[PDB]
Design a protein around this ligand. Structure first.
Ligand SMILES: *[C@@H]1O[C@H](CO)[C@@H](O[C@@H]2O[C@H](CO)[C@@H](O)[C@H](O)[C@H]2NC(C)=O)[C@H](O)[C@H]1NC(C)=O
Ligand SMILES: *[C@@H]1O[C@H](CO)[C@@H](O[C@@H]2O[C@H](CO)[C@@H](O)[C@H](O)[C@H]2NC(C)=O)[C@H](O)[C@H]1NC(C)=O
Lengths: 153, 141
């Protein structure tokens, strides 16, 4: 895939995010970091282990969000260009699936980010993300979540 | 302004580069105790950060406070490689780093303890520039 000054696009080679990421898709690896494929994989491992603490509703949504956010699909082009999470995807997880662990813990983060549910996790700030309805191709949408009760919109 | 020797402390054993010598700043009357005390004080805040950040943050703090010395009989303290600094501050500790750094810096200032702050990562050299010119944190290898 495309390579450039700040990173490159390549197929995912790990096992944690295997079921979430599109099989043949290219994802962005950030060469600001050393051996980014290894570093990103070590991070997602540790992130997923922390998600054993969250509710059964929240878990698959947060897992998918962390995967789509830490391994961002590359949009077509000659440059390596990561697609951010759609705002609606972010807000869904924040306000619906993980409401108790994320939205509710806002303003209670003074007790410690690690002691505040989910706020220590490398999740994006949903306000700073583009919309599904501004350009549905410019961001990653909420994928199929495997649950094996539900928030309503 | 100091000497290079084997790390003789308790905190940073697994965290420093294997079989390397590290830098002791002789601006302190007891550099090995003073630098040991700095990482001890840092651990008060390390306690409080998540296991996503904690091992990365410790690696950075230990290797910063106990700089790896270059090879040779007149060795020099190496900087941390830019990439490793960025991975720690902005990947592994993306949410928690600045708050932990604020708290650690201020606890040191309150105590009247002399210290160097972790550098701005962008001011550091790349690992690709010259692999022998900067420290690669063992946590990330
Ligand atoms: C690749 O990594 C770099 C370094 O961490 C990122 O640049 C930082 O972006 C954050 C936003 O999360 C800013 O707050 C920092 O000021 C930036 N740091 C530097 C040194 O520029 C960059 O965003 C990453 N690229 C992608 C596409 O995620
Ligand atoms: C050895 O330690 C001393 C004291 O902590 C360092 O001196 C400080 O250096 C910074 C440079 O940014 C200055 O802002 C301070 O004024 C200095 N403090 C004092 C009281 O002298 C010195 O840089 C260290 N040397 C090395 C090579 O690490």
């Amino acid at each position: 895939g495309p390579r450039g000054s700040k990173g490159y696009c390549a197929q995912y080679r790990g096992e944690v995010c295997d079921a979430v990421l599109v099989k043949d898709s290219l994802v962005f690896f950030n060469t600001s970091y050393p051996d980014p494929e290894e570093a990103q994989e070590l991070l997602i491992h540790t992130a997923w282990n922390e998600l054993k603490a969250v509710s059964p509703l929240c878990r698959p949504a947060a897992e998918a969000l962390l995967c789509n956010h830490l391994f961002q699909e590359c949009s077509p082009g000659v440059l390596p260009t990561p697609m951010p999470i759609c705002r609606e995807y972010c807000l869904a997880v924040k306000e619906l699936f993980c409401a108790k662990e994320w939205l509710a813990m806002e303003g209670k983060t003074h007790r410690g980010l690690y002691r505040s549910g989910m706020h220590f996790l490398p999740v994006p700030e949903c306000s700073k993300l583009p919309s599904m309805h501004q350009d549905p191709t410019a961001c990653t949408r909420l994928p199929y979540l495997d649950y094996k009760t539900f928030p309503s919109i």
